[PDB]
């Protein structure tokens, strides 16, 4: 009956967890991850590589879904969506509905859900085994609004929840991370890490 998605980490039977590239904090960087904050900083609409790690290969038809929720208690029940400006920008990639914050880049089998009961948005792809040479698979996400967008996120922090699901949509595994979509991810990461250190 509930409609706030769980954010509880759950490796489950296949040992599912995320990984992120070591991109550093140069002012040219477009996506960078802070382990200390469990937080991804990225530029608007730029590629965000997220690694999917498992201890064992899940069955054919396993899928991976991404969904954003507001991190603060008082905002958790509100659907995370694009702002009144971006949803009207005609920046369709062919597949993503205009209201969806999170897109997957470069995957023909990406499916976008507007949940009929909760009204939440998500994007889901087939979970593919690592290519020869790789130990993991990578999904490329894009975030299509700034954290600061007025009438959208409006400076409120979000989490992305990544779920590993069977072909029916049943939970196999879960992980999550905070996201800030910003003009200078490198600088903003250095700043927030400094603040944490000082605290």
Q: Is 127 annotated as a binding residue?
A: no
Binding residue for Zn ion (CB under 5 A) from 58, 152, 173, 185? 152
Work out which of 54, 67, 80, 145 binds Zn ion, going by CB under 5 A: 145
Figure out which of the listed residues 48, 68, 80, 83 binds Zn ion, where binding follows CB under 5 A.
83
What is the nearest approach in angstroms of Zn ion to the Cβ of residue 145? 3
| Number of Cβ atoms within 10 Å of the Cβ of 52 | 20
Say if residue 145 carries a ligand binding annotation.
yes
- Which one of 80-88, 161-169, 178-186, 190-198 is the stretch in contact with Zn ion (CB under 5 A)? 80-88
- Residue number with CB closer to Zn ion (46 or 190): 46
In the complex with Zn ion, which residue's Cβ is closer, 29 or 149?
149
Asked whether 70 and 178 are in contact (CB, 8 A), the reply is no
The answer to whether the annotation marks 149 as part of a ligand binding site is yes
Q: Residue numbers of the site for Zn ion (CB under 5 A)?
A: 83, 86, 145, 149, 152
Annotated binding-site residues read 83, 86, 145, 149
């Amino acid at each position: 009956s509930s409609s706030v998605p769980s954010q509880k980490t759950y490796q489950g039977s296949y040992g599912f967890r995320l990984g992120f590239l070591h991109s550093g904090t140069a002012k040219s960087v477009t996506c960078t991850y802070s382990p200390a904050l469990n937080k991804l900083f990225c530029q608007l609409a730029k590629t965000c590589p997220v690694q999917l790690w498992v201890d064992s290969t899940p069955p054919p038809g396993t899928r991976v879904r991404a969904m954003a929720i507001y991190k603060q208690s008082q905002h958790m029940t509100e659907v995370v969506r694009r702002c009144p400006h971006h949803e009207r920008c005609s920046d369709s990639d062919g597949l993503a509905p205009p209201q969806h914050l999170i897109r997957v880049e470069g995957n023909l089998r990406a499916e976008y859900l507007d949940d009929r009961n909760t009204f939440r948005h998500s994007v889901v792809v087939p979970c593919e085994p690592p290519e020869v040479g790789s130990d993991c698979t990578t999904i490329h996400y894009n975030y299509m609004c700034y954290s600061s967008c007025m009438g959208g996120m409006n400076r409120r922090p979000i989490l992305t929840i990544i779920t590993l699901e069977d072909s029916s949509g049943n939970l196999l595994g879960r992980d999550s991370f905070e996201v800030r979509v910003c003009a200078c991810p490198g600088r903003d990461r250095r700043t927030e890490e400094e603040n944490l250190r000082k605290k």
